[PDB]
């Protein structure tokens, strides 16, 4: 359509990256841990990005006692294995057929919940991004679909505004009809890109709305709320979170306040270009109990060229 091409709209980010600027950047949800934990990373090659990690976490229930994890990546290929104590294997592979077209497969294998298999194919266009993923996909003798399949579509209505929906198909056993749900997603970006707003009308009447603002090159802040719902009368269990992140040439700081009353901060001192020390403390004023954990990021290499590059 010729007359439709005049708009010249920009491709919005993928659906998963909707809350990246807030959830994964200006919040501790991902970076937080507990108790001591040492992370040793070994670099072997850069142009072909290859790496070997280790982990020694003690006192953290979420983290494992030990975790070996080797990461490889190239221009169009990316892979990552993750051995875990108790021989819990986790793996992920990302292959880019085209510059803008990439297919990703994730597989976690263990003794509990054996072989959760996820495969998804991502497409990115000039103005829209669509990705479809299938959780624990399989087939049945009756021939109907089995497992969970999710398809998400996001189209930029205007250069500063992108709207999209997320389709969900789930079928636990196959005997009963597979429940399906739809969620609406919205992403607003300021003309100057100074601040970004994202809204997610998740299924089951749950709203996840967040805001992001770049105060300056060092300081960016954002907030996020939630309005989960229920029924025995309706039960609504939500929380509002305010978080700010300070980044500097030597350290990165993240702070966050929770409507539940808990307060948390996350500091990362780059004492050396390689070695980085992480501190992570949280308080729970409602119950008056504190979560705390320090860490390490020892960052050795294994090649003379890599060491020379590391030192400059």
């Amino acid at each position: 359509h010729s007359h439709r091409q005049s708009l010249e709209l920009v491709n919005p980010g993928t659906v998963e990256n909707l809350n990246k600027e807030v959830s994964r950047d200006v919040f501790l949800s991902q970076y937080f841990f507990t108790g001591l934990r040492a992370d040793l990373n070994k670099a072997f090659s850069m142009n072909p990005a290859f790496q070997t990690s280790h982990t020694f976490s003690i006192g953290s229930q979420a983290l494992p006692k030990y975790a070996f994890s080797a990461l490889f990546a190239n221009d169009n290929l990316f892979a990552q294995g993750n051995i875990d104590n108790d021989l819990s294997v986790s793996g992920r592979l990302n292959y880019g057929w085209d510059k803008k077209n990439i297919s990703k497969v994730n597989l976690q294998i263990s003794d509990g919940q054996p072989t959760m298999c996820q495969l998804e194919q991502d497409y990115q266009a000039s103005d829209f991004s669509v990705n479809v993923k299938t959780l624990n996909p399989s087939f049945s003798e009756k021939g109907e679909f089995t497992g969970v399949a999710v398809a998400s579509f996001l189209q930029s209505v205007t250069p500063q505004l992108a709207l999209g929906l997320e389709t969900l198909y789930s079928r636990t056993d196959g005997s009963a009809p597979g429940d399906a749900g739809v969620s609406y997603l919205t992403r607003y970006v300021s003309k100057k890109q100074d601040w970004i707003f994202s809204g997610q009308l998740q299924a089951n009447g749950a709203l996840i709305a967040s805001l992001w603002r770049k105060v300056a090159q060092n300081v960016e802040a954002g907030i996020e709320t939630t309005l989960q719902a229920g029924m025995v009368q309706p039960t609504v269990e939500g929380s509002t979170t305010i978080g700010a992140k300070y980044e500097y040439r030597q350290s990165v700081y993240r702070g966050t306040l929770d409507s539940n009353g808990k307060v948390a901060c996350f500091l990362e001192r780059k004492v050396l270009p390689t070695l980085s020390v992480l501190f992570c403390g949280e308080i729970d004023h409602f119950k008056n109990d504190t979560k705390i954990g320090c860490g390490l990021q020892f960052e050795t290499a294994g090649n003379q060229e890599l060491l020379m590059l590391q030192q400059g």
């Binding site: 300070y246 500097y248 040439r249 030597q250 350290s251 990165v252 700081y253 702070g255 306040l257 307060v263 901060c265 500091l267 001192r269 501190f279 403390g281 308080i283 004023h285």
Partner: protein, 50 residues
């Protein structure tokens, strides 16, 4: 006494505020101090250069 209840509640609130302020300010204070110290460093090395 209701006055006593108000007093203890206010004291608890002040304690909570101070604890939160420390927890969220101290690490940021260390970060700012380190950054400004590094800025002074670079300034000193430059002054050495010229």
């Amino acid at each position: 006494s209701f006055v006593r209840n108000a007093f203890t509640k206010s004291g608890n609130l002040a304690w909570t505020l101070t604890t939160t302020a420390l927890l969220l300010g101290v690490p940021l204070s260390l970060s700012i101090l380190a950054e400004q110290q590094l800025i002074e460093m670079e300034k000193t090395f430059d002054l050495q250069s010229d």
